[PDB]
Amino acid sequence: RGDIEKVTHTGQVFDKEDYRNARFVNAKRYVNENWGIKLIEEVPPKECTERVVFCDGGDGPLGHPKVYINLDKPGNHICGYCGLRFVKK
Amino acid sequence: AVQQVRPILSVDREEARKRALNLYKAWYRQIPYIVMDYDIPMTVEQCRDKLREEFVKHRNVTDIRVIDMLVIKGQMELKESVEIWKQKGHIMRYWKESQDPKPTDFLSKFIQGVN
Amino acid sequence: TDGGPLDPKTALARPEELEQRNKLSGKITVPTAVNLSPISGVPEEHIRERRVRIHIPPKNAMQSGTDNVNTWQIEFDNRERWENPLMGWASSGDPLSNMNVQFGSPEEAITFCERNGWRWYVDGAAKPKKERVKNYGINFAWNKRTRVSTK
Amino acid sequence: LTNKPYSFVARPWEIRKVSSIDVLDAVGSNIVVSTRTNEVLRILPRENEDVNEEWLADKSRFACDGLKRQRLVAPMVRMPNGELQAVEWEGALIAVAKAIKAAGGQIAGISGQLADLEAQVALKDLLNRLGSEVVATEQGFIAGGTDNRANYLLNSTIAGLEEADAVLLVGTNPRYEAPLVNTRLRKAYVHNELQIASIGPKIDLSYDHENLGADAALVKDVCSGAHAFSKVLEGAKKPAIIIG
Amino acid sequence: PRPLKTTNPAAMKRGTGGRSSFNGIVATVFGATGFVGRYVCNKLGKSGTQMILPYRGDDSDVIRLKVTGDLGQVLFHFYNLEDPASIRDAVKHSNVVINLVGRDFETKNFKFKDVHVNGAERIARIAREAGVERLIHLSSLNVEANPKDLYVKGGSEWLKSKYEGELRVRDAFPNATIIRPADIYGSEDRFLRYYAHIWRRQFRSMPLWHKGEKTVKQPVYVSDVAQAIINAAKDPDSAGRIYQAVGPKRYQLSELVDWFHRLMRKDQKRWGYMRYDMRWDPTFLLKAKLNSFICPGTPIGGLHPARIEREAVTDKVLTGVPTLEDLGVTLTTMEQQVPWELRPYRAALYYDAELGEFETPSPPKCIEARDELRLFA
Amino acid sequence: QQTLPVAEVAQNLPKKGYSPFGTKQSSVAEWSLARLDDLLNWGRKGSIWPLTFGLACCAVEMMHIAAPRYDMDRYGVVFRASPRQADVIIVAGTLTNKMAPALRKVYDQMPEPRWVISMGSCANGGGYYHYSYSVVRGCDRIIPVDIYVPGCPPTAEALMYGVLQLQKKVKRMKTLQMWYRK
Amino acid sequence: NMDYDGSMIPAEWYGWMHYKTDLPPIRDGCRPKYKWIADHSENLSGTKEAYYPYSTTPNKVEAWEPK
């Protein structure tokens, strides 16, 4: 079984010499296959024209609170709530 | 110093000592009815030795209100033992039959754990 | 007094019963130093082992407010916490590790600890206030090193 | 402006605040330690007006990670194959006891920098009970200065050093050796018009100061009275001389 | 000197002596369903030991062992003594293996060799191959190479099987804490429940071998054996040793049975209890053989010829072999427990007796060394 | 973790059957004991008798499987007052310090076989009174538990889910085949 | 057969069966369908493929490592 030696997205796995792998001989280990890091870097950054942009989660009242991100600094600016990346050319 | 308070069932130390001796007499009479009824694994002599130890660990107090509060609480346990009002799990709580004893020397306390 | 029916449990009582009721209605002389360790129901191990700290709580250095500083409090010495092997919480065998008791003066907490028989100690006394002069004219001064370079 | 080692770790209502004193600097600054679920989180200042006055050094504050890394968790004994192996407590204690019995009179002990008073007292009591009259401390000192406290004491109070009028530094850098003393000297420089001379190499004390030189002989000259800063120290109302 | 294998901060001992803490012992308890296994599991769960309990039957037999441990300290496993893969899955993360696996009677699937010898070899070999540090397999007190039969033909196969098993475990696992107990008395036992049962006595009369006079036994209380197992697990110096597990005093079987029936309120006059020699009784052995034959599982009252040979033999200790006092455990006298233990087996419990209605019976006489050598001469 | 199969894969699989022990066991005696165990578990998972215990608020939900929306008597489940005439005790409510020997005595006087359903958060792990002085931290540490109904008030749908899962546990319970392989 | 329970109903039909919505998922165009939405699973308690908890944080105190 490979779920015992599988690593979660928080970087946790039990060692081979650990006694705590004896709890998994009768119940399988639950490791989430959808890591949030890979699915947030799969989303491409959004190119914007304005100096500041607003983010609200993409759902309105069902997203995160609306925050404003400055884009005058070059590079990719990451929203601290949802992880969407904005960029200004 | 000095303080004027309302008393509890006794004015001086002699009446409180008489009430403590009345507790010892009533608990002595109540022990053989405790043993035959409660289904506990304790001999009558072990019960009387435990009663003596319970009085010995409260010999050290001197204040008459503390002594009379102890008399009131012991009378409550006596009334909870004349009527059965209890189970065998609570009678054996005086002996502490489930707690494994811990060592008192510093080397064994150092080896076992920080407590 | 009144010419009505008298109380039957006082008229028919023995002289020893009238003396017993009047002695309990009086005031006895007791010492004010009273140890209440066997009455409080605390186990004796926590009486002989735990140390009690009376302290004014520390001000949060990130916050200018001093309302939570305005009381004294009793807290108990921190014992061993550990990780349970199942799931990773902070198990603790100390029942008194979570109790902070509020008090007005350290003398009240000292008398309370002498009442309950705890082994008490005071970490620090009341903080004296130093008179510091603050006004806006020191920031713009002539031949002084306290002239500010900001603003 | 946020603590980057304390990045999203815990929350302030959750924190058990415990009063402590930092030991890395020699100021002995009063701190409060953030403990939550049996782990250190951050070090924050606790207000003592005499010692630190709501100020904490970066080394005293941002070393809460050092209690997590390179720790010792098991008693280790060097087995005779050449490797240090982790053993039980009782076996390590009887191994040290057998080495002590094999020593037979030649026993010495060195105290370090993170040791408290009680471990030093217990170590000296163990060495004196075993017949050893020699104990050691890592940082050296003069000969014969042990009997009087004032040879190794900051005799002027740290809260009193803000009232100094002219100080002299003899080979010390208080910006890095004990930074809250440098905050007190900066406060006395700003408010009390303190003029300061230093002996040694060129250093930045975060204020304007004059370096007299690097030779030790001018240390005599300030004690001789020929140098002008000796007249400055004699004419000052509250003078002090700080020696590293 | 003594190395520590785990060197992991999650694996070291932490906390106090309660159930929620961890004592650093990961114990696998073979045969935890049975009589010794409940007390062993409770004494392990008092100290916070993470226990792997392997069961061979139903889940309802071992569902009662979740009470002894906390959350995460009890892990159930399914095994069989003919399958080494389940034992390999059971002991792969264990520091302590306790072998309480045994059976007092023959079974159609497991003989005495299949449960005391070969199953013990499978458990010990798998535990040695899995890196288990300790192994605390039990034994019997009177184990010998050729134990002579006292009453029945075909008896003492159990003692020979336990003897061959204990030397083959000591051959296979080189440092195993072998404990040899005598007859063990407790709740849910076979010793008091065998004498208290209806099927042992015949028409309110008690049959005993040589009237119980020539058999001298030194019985041991079950929590003493369990605490000896705990103290052998905690002490690394007990490895590769044989520990005798007997009680503090020696008695003969006639005095023990008379004291049991005095505790049971079954006297000579009112109840009609009498003691007679079992050697002149041919009915009782045929009754025991019929009870062993017609029962598809456990015999009624624990009555079988192997139990007759187990009560027939005299408890003999060997000089130079350490007792339970070497393990640091105190010993419980029968006068502290057996008056409580024979309380549900008392006769005429319907009678609402007063305080002085039934007299407290006298304690039984204990046989000394000189009286034992005069009796056995 | 596995999911429920797609309907093409479900059409590929055959029917499971009523027997959880399989159709054939390659022995006449094993087949006879397995069918006797199937009949016995059908007689035991049919009409388990819970116990009139009712410590607290979760009990009020227990009458909502009595109430005619959910009808526990449809499944054979029917309350009996005495613990001798009961298979199940539904520990549902706050188990306090005074009810520890009460629950232990009522569970011990109940005859084998014994299955205990722990209904409600107080009976599972103490719940909203977990950190108090008087409340026992769940009913596991006194008596064994086979079924853990998780809701604080469970829906009576969720209580009968625990009852049906207990019936499936009794359906998988094997004693005669264990006797043949012991 | 004889293994049906209330956990076999998937997430889209759960509100329709429990009378939360009157709209079946055939004509419910508001229900999302993402790439990370897993298929429905029943209750796996009493089975070898059950859930058992563990600590998600790794070890926060590192030892020495003399070598």
Ligand SMILES: NC(=O)C1=CN([C@@H]2O[C@H](COP(=O)(O)OP(=O)(O)OC[C@H]3O[C@@H](n4cnc5c(N)ncnc54)[C@H](OP(=O)(O)O)[C@@H]3O)[C@@H](O)[C@H]2O)C=CC1
């Ligand atoms: N008076 C006594 O009890 C004495 C006991 N001993 C020894 O102490 C040990 C424990 O004794 P005790 O508790 O009384 O005995 P029990 O019969 O009460 O318990 C034996 C245990 O072993 C299991 N077991 C039995 N047969 C097998 C098998 N073929 N394969 C796998 N597991 C099996 C049983 O499981 P299950 O119940 O599920 O079938 C049970 O858990 C034994 O080794 C015994 O020889 C020695 C001297 C005296």
Ligand SMILES: CCCCCCCCCCCC
């Ligand atoms: C019902 C009759 C039972 C008889 C049991 C044997 C009695 C033997 C007595 C021997 C002389 C004391």
Ligand SMILES: CCCCCCCCCCCC
């Ligand atoms: C069922 C009858 C049993 C009788 C047991 C006692 C026999 C006493 C006489 C023996 C003569 C050798």
Ligand code: SF4
């Ligand atoms: S689990 Fe919830 S509903 Fe049930 S008794 Fe406790 S508080 Fe009441």
Ligand SMILES: [Zn+2]
């Ligand atoms: Zn966003």
